[PDB]
């Protein structure tokens, strides 16, 4: 009887999320109402207005313009004006019932199963922004129909100003405070990293801060994140926009065969700071990441470094798990994990999920006081869109989109511009026999640094890095007869002070190429640090009885003849403490002067057997022992080889 | 055996309340359908009334008004 009590509770269980999902279906069910209530008023007035738009785009065929443009300017009862004032009434929600179609909009960008972009601030505030562009565009189709037509001039800014006002302002006084600003990866896709030290540090110049990160999956992974200047009311300065690329993303958030530990720890600052640093570091299996964040005035627009707090995760025992095996894979972020506008930074978040293995970097921003302070109060704004495409890289001209092609240069007549070859029709450069395209890039080559030589090619392609002078190739292009585009990412290092080396594009003997998407970017990829040498042969403290003879140091029993000699632990890291006793019962102890031992390994009978174990430091650096000492009352020790150095960093 | 009944009559109370939320929303839902019932046949009347009415305010510019007045008329 309980356990059918028991399958009975299930099945109720069962019904109420069956009435949650009811609940969820019927809350889809009325916003979709409220869009057809919104639509059976908006339709008419947008379809003509968008048509009238995309009409009069040329000027902005004489006879039917000119009967277009007075069928417009016609004053009657169903006229262009008439559109407009109509659609103004329903945006701002002057219809029978008093329903503003804003406010029904935002409820559905809101309420969407799909994540594009980022917070729902930058969605909503670019479809307003799309709104008032029509409208402004309309307005200023209908001032051109009049002025072709030769009619009386009217000043339609004024009514304009006063519908942009007033659509702004229902915009912030209703919508606005209810959006939250929090953005996260819009995809997901599955990798298998390594279990090898990797240390990723998005830092920043002092007067900078990041507004913004931006992951692809290519065939290097790529951690592109921007830093630039604040101006005022937390506004991206343009001009100074930077980027830094990264290359062991997939090593960094997932495990290749041996597990990996994550410390999740909600970054949260208070208003006024600007987070200006992020640095991750996977030592073994164990992803910790903190944060730097300077304060920041927003009346002057200065990031002052003498204030400034630092949430850590690295001194935090609580961590979650994900197994990772070969048959699955956990889901790393993908995407434009940024505003839809360039902005700073408030808090950083990295969720982690067991239940489907994915990984989320939610943020927040500070959008909403750059629009108050910007746009909403009829002031100048100016928005930056994240750049889609690497503008850090050193080849000028990097797609051939422009004409008159400078920094590319033709030996001959053989090699031309292919406009149909390439992306789409991004104009690739063709190369077919002798000819070859060069272009000099060491006017930015810097010297001894790490490089991406990214590159998209139909073909037989040849890219041979080489230095102009003496025939010295830095980089081979052999083989490659692919047909398709597809990417050639290869890691490249920079040799000692070149300083004239240019990139040349040329097709094998025989086939033909087509080449384009040539970016040079600049990486800072780390490496596993060799390690400190805490433990050495020259701080040995003896006390009672020793006998220390070349580097077989004794420990003598039934005394107090011992050895010590303190060392410098971290909170969290694995040390390899490889030695050799030769004593009977000997053992070296780790105490901390308060009973808590790290390691022990006690001699049996005799000879020197290498002991080459390892230990944690659980989480108390307070300065720990390597004491030598015998408690038999025999045998004297010898230990020989002592070496204790932190596993990869 | 008597206090898991007790707790399941208190889950099914809470279904209950679950069940009259479920029907107020489609008591909301069926007069948004009215009212969209009623807007798909006054939108354009109201909104050509209204803008003709918001136009000839100023006389209760004469081109344009003439020309107005002939397209009402």
Same mark, same amino acid.
């Given at each position: 009887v309980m356990k059918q009590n028991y399958a009975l509770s299930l099945q109720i269980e069962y019904l109420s999320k069956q009435l949650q999902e009811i609940s969820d279906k019927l809350d889809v069910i009325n916003l979709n109402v409220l869009i057809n209530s919104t639509l059976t008023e908006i339709t008419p007035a947008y379809q003509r207005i968008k048509y009238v738009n995309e009409k009069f785009?040329?000027?902005?065929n004489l006879t039917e313009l000119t009967e277009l443009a007075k069928s417009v300017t016609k004053n009657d009862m169903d006229s262009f004006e008439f559109y407009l004032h109509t659609f103004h009434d329903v945006l701002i929600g002057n219809n029978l019932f008093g329903r503003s179609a804003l406010k029904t909009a935002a409820e559905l960008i809101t309420k969407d199963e799909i994540k594009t972009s980022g917070s729902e601030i930058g969605k909503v505030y670019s479809f307003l922004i799309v709104l008032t562009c029509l409208q402004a565009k309309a307005f200023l189709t209908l001032t051109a129909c009049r002025k072709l037509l030769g009619l009386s001039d009217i000043d339609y800014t004024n009514i304009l100003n006063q519908h942009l006002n007033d659509e702004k302002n229902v915009f912030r006084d209703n919508i606005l405070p209810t959006l939250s600003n929090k953005f996260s990866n819009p995809n997901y896709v599955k990798t298998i990293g390594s279990d090898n030290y990797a240390k990723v540090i998005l830092e920043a110049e002092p007067g900078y801060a990041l507004v913004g990160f931006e992951i692809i999956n290519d065939r290097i992974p790529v951690l592109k994140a921007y830093k630039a200047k604040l101006k005022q009311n937390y506004q991206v300065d343009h001009q100074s926009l930077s980027e830094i690329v990264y290359l062991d993303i997939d090593k960094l958030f997932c495990p290749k065969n041996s597990e990996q530990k994550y410390y999740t720890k909600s970054l949260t600052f208070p208003d006024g700071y600007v987070i200006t640093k992020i640095t991750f570091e996977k030592k073994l299996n164990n992803l910790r990441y903190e944060a730097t964040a300077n304060f920041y005035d927003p009346s002057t627009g200065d990031i002052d470094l003498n204030e400034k707090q630092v949430e850590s995760?690295?001194?935090?025992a609580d961590y979650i798990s994900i197994n990772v095996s070969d048959d699955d894979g956990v889901y790393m972020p993908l995407g434009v994990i940024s505003e839809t506008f360039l902005s700073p930074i408030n808090s950083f978040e990295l969720e982690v999920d067991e239940k489907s293995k994915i990984l989320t970097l939610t943020c927040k921003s500070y959008l909403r006081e750059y629009l108050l302070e910007? +746009?909403?109060?009829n002031k100048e704004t100016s928005l930056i869109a994240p750049p889609?495409?690497?503008?850090?890289?050193?080849?000028?001209?990097?797609?051939?989109?422009?004409?008159?092609?400078?920094?590319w240069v033709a030996n001959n007549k053989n090699a031309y511009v292919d406009s149909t070859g390439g992306i789409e029709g991004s104009k690739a450069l063709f190369t077919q026999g002798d000819g070859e395209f060069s272009q000099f890039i060491? +006017?930015?080559?810097?010297?001894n640094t790490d490089y991406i030589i990214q590159y998209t090619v139909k073909g037989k392609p040849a890219i041979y890095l080489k230095n102009? @002078?003496?025939?010295?190739?830095?980089y081979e292009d052999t083989?490659?007869?692919?047909e398709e585009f597809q990417t050639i990412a290869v890691n490249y290092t920079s040799e000692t002070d070149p300083s004239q080396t240019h990139l040349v594009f040329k097709s094998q003997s025989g086939y033909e190429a087509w080449g384009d998407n040539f970016i040079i970017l600049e990486c800072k990829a780390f490496e596993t640090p060799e390690g400190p040498?805490?433990?050495?042969?020259? +701080?040995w403290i003896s006390f009672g009885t020793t006998y220390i003879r070349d580097d077989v140091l004794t420990i003598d029993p039934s005394r107090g003849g011992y050895f010590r000699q303190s060392l410098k632990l971290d909170s969290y890291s694995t040390y390899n403490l490889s030695f050799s006793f030769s004593g009977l019962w000997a053992k070296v102890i780790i105490k @901390?002067?308060?009973?808590?031992?790290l390691f022990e390994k006690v001699s049996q009978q005799?000879?020197?057997? +290498?002991i080459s174990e390892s230990f944690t430091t659980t989480s108390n650096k307070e300065g720990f022992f390597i004491e030598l000492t015998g408690d038999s009352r025999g045998g004297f020790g010898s230990f020989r080889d002592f070496s204790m150095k932190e596993k990869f960093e």
């Open positions: 785009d040329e000027l902005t995760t690295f001194l935090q910007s +746009d909403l109060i889609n495409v690497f503008i850090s890289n050193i080849v000028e001209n990097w797609n051939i989109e422009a004409d008159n092609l400078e920094p060491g +006017d930015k080559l810097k010297p102009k @002078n003496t025939g010295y190739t830095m083989n490659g007869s692919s040498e805490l433990i050495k042969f020259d +701080d @901390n002067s308060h009973g808590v031992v005799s000879s020197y057997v +290498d």
